[PDB]
Amino acid sequence: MIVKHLEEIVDTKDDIDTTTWNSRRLLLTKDGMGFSLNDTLIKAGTETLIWYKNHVEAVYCIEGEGEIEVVGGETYPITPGMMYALDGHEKHYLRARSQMRMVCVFNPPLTGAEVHDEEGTYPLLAPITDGSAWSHPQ
Ligand SMILES: CC(=O)NCC[C@H](N)C(=O)O
Ligand SMILES: [Fe+3]
């Protein structure tokens, strides 16, 4: 038996924050289920190029709006209830108009190394600046 809660995972080592996405990992390779499972926020205004050569991924949008553009294929708007699955290891752009909340399943599971390494993802456009600078401790 495994029991977890998103509200425990947030702001913890299983919450991986990147320039375009915050992935809250629910089932890890360690959990032995044969897949990994996460709840990922795709930040508003962002664009990320994605290509998982070594995994298939299912993505189910439960909040927000954006689009996925398949390189050499079509562009599919993303809204709550939209599901896509990359059974052909498709290279794709993932764009968020508003913040998107995505339940994601990977077939072999992703490892912690792969998530930290951002393997298979290339962030291209980050959220608009909030006015902060690294050199402003205030
Ligand atoms: C929604 C999406 O595709 N996020 C990509 C990150 C992925 N969930 C991962 O953990 O590598
Ligand atoms: Fe994806």
Numbering used by the authors: 1 to 138
Question: What is the paper's account of this structure, in its own sentences?
Answer:
To obtain crystals of the (Pl)EctC enzyme with its substrate N-γ-ADABA or its reaction product ectoine, we added these compounds to a final concentration of 40 mM and of 20 mM, respectively, to (Pl)EctC preparations pre-incubated with iron. However, crystallization with this substrate was carried out at pH 4.2, conditions under which the (Pl)EctC protein is practically enzymatically inactive. The substrate N-γ-ADABA was added in large excess (40 mM) to the crystallization solution; however, the obtained crystal structure displayed only a partially bound molecule, which resulted in an occupancy of 68% after refinement. The N-γ-ADABA molecule is coordinated within the active site of the (Pl)EctC enzyme through six direct interactions with residues Trp-21, Arg-25, Asn-38, Thr-40, Tyr-52, and Glu-57. First, a direct interaction occurs between the O atom of the acetyl group of N-γ-ADABA (acetamide oxygen) and the iron co-factor with a distance of 2.6 Å. Notably, Trp-21 adopts a dual conformation in the crystal structure of the (Pl)EctC::Fe/N-γ-ADABA complex, in line with the observed partial occupancy of the crystals with the bound substrate. The comparison of the (Pl)EctC::Fe and the (Pl)EctC::Fe/N-γ-ADABA structures therefore suggests that the presence of the N-γ-ADABA molecule within the substrate-binding site of the ectoine synthase induces the reorientation of the side-chain of Trp-21 to provide additional stabilizing contacts to the N-γ-ADABA molecule. As can be observed in the (Pl)EctC::Fe/N-γ-ADABA structure, the water is replaced by the amide carbonyl group of N-γ-ADABA upon substrate binding. The (Pl)EctC::Fe/N-γ-ADABA structure reveals an extended conformation of the substrate within the catalytic core. The distance between the carbonyl C-atom and the α-amino group of the bound N-γ-ADABA molecule (4.1 Å) is far too large to allow a direct enzymatic attack to initiate ring closure.
